[PDB]
Amino acid sequence: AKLVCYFTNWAQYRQGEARFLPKDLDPSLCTHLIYAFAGMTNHQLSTTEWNDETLYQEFNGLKKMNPKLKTLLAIGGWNFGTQKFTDMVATANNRQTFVNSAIRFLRKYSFDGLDLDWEYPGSQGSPAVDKERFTTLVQDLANAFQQEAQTSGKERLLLSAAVPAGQTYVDAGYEVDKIAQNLDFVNLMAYDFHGSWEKVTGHNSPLYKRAASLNVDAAVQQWLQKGTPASKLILGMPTYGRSFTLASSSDTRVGAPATGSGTPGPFTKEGGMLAYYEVCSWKGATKQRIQDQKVPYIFRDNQWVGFDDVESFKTKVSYLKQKGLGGAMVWALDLDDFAGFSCNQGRYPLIQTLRQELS
C-alpha cells in the first residue's frame, strides 16, 4: 500500500509553531513524498519559491536516510491556473520543450518523478480541446520517461496526476481509461466536496452521501468505473477542514444555511479552511459526527467546520482496503498536527493513523 504525502513550499512562511520546513518531515512516515508546487516559464518546468533549490536538496536528501522513500515534484495547483498548461500543450513543439525540461529538472534535483496537478483540463478557463491534449501530454511524458530510462539505464521516472472527484470536472477533462494506462498512480482528491462556495453547510470529505455523488465513495466508484485500475487509485485524505459562518447560531446541522466562509484560522489565515491542528485547538466548541457520512464536524456560536479526525481516517482506510485500492494520499503534511503541539495526540496524529492502519 502506498502512503503519498504532499509537502507545500509556502508552509515555510507560517508563523511560530505552524512554520513547516523539510526538517519537519518524518522521512519514514510516508512511502512517497510529493513537493508542491513547481511552476512553468516559457514552457519549461521552474521553481515557484526563491529558496526551492535549497529545499529540493533537503527534501530529496532525506532518501539518504531512507533508501526506499520516493519523491516527486508536483506542477500546478489551484492558484497556478490553467493558461500556462493550455499554451504548453497547444503544440507538439511546446510539449517537447516541457517534457525535456521536466526530465532534466527532475534528474538535476534528484526527484524520482513528476506529479501533474493541472486544475483542471477543460475547466477553470481551460477549453474543451484540453481534455485530449492532456491525454497526449500524459503519453508524451510516459513515452519520454520510458525512453530516458532505456537510454540512461536509470530507473524510470514516475508519473502521477492529482485528479478531481467532481463528476463535472472528471468528464470535462479526463479520458480516464487512456491516461490511467500511462500513469503509475492516480492521486484522487477525495475532498473539497463541499465548501463555503455553497450557501448551505456541508462536509469537506464525507465518505457516503447523507448531490448524491458528492462523497468519497461515489468519487472512487467513478474513477474505477471509468477505467482506473484499483492498484493505481490512491485515495486522498484531508488533514484540514472546510469552514462556514452560519446564518444563525440556532441551526448548526449539516445542510444549515450559511452566509459564507468561516473565520480564518490563526496560522493558516485563509477563510473557508482550517488546519487540523487549528480545529483541535477550538475552545468551547461542540463536536458532532455525521452518522451517514462517517465524518465529524464542530461548531461554536456562528462558526461551523467539517473536518477529518483519527476516527474518520481509520474508517476511510478500512474502506479503501475493502475496495482493494493502491493506498492513501494526504493533503497536507503541514496541516496535520506535525509537531504534536496542538492536539496532544503526538506527532502527525492523522497521517500516523493512515500509516498504522495501512500497515
Tell me the CATH number at 245: 3.10.50.10
Dihedral (CA of 278, 282, 285, 287) sign: positive
- Residues labelled as active-site residues: 119
Distance from C-alpha of 184 to C-alpha of 233, rounded to nearest angstrom: 9
Does 78 belong to an annotated binding site? yes
Does 49 belong to an annotated binding site? yes
Question: Residue for cell digits 496560522?
Answer: 267
Count Cβ atoms below 10 Å from residue 152 Cβ, excluding itself.
12
Pairing of strands 273-275, 240-246: antiparallel
Give the residue numbers spanning the domain of 267.
239-309
How many structural domains is the chain composed of?
2
Do residues 120 and 177 both lie within one domain?
yes
Distance from C-alpha of 61 to C-alpha of 158, rounded to nearest angstrom: 18
Distance from C-alpha of 248 to C-alpha of 15, rounded to nearest angstrom: 32
Does 11 belong to an annotated binding site? no
Count Cβ atoms below 10 Å from residue 271 Cβ, excluding itself.
16
Distance from C-alpha of 357 to C-alpha of 237, rounded to nearest angstrom: 13
State which amino acid sits at residue 302. Answer: N
Q: Coil, strand, or helix at residue 269?
A: coil
Do residues 221 and 265 both lie within one domain?
no
Do residues 159 and 271 both lie within one domain?
no
Distance from C-alpha of 103 to C-alpha of 98, rounded to nearest angstrom: 9
Answer yes or no: are the C-beta atoms of 1 and 355 closer than 8 Å: no
Does 198 belong to an annotated binding site? no
Do residues 209 and 284 both lie within one domain?
no
Cα 83 vs. chain centroid, distance in angstroms? 21
Nearest-10 Cα torsion for 268, 271, 275, 277: 80
List 172's β-bridge partners, or say none: none
Burial label, 279 (beta-carbon count in 10 A; 0-12, 13-18, 19+)? buried
Q: Coil, strand, or helix at residue 193?
A: coil
Question: Residue for cell digits 513515452?
Answer: 143
Does 58 belong to an annotated binding site? no
Q: What does the DSSP 8-state code read for residue 155?
A: P
Answer yes or no: are the C-beta atoms of 223 and 164 closer than 8 Å: no
Do residues 254 and 156 both lie within one domain?
no
Do residues 357 and 234 both lie within one domain?
yes
Do residues 26 and 119 both lie within one domain?
yes
Do residues 176 and 264 both lie within one domain?
no
Dihedral (CA of 299, 329, 126, 86) sign: positive
Q: Coil, strand, or helix at residue 197?
A: coil
Closest CA to 162 of 215, 123, 121: 121
Nearest-10 Cα torsion for 40, 45, 50, 52: 140
Does 297 belong to an annotated binding site? no
182-212 exposure pattern, b = at least 16 Cβ within 10 A, e = fewer: bbbbbbbbbbbbbbbeeeebbbbbbbbeeee
Answer yes or no: are the C-beta atoms of 233 and 186 closer than 8 Å: yes
Do residues 301 and 316 both lie within one domain?
no
Q: Determination technique for this PDB entry?
A: X-ray
Count Cβ atoms below 10 Å from residue 253 Cβ, excluding itself.
12
Does 118 belong to an annotated binding site? no
CATH number at residue 122: 3.20.20.80
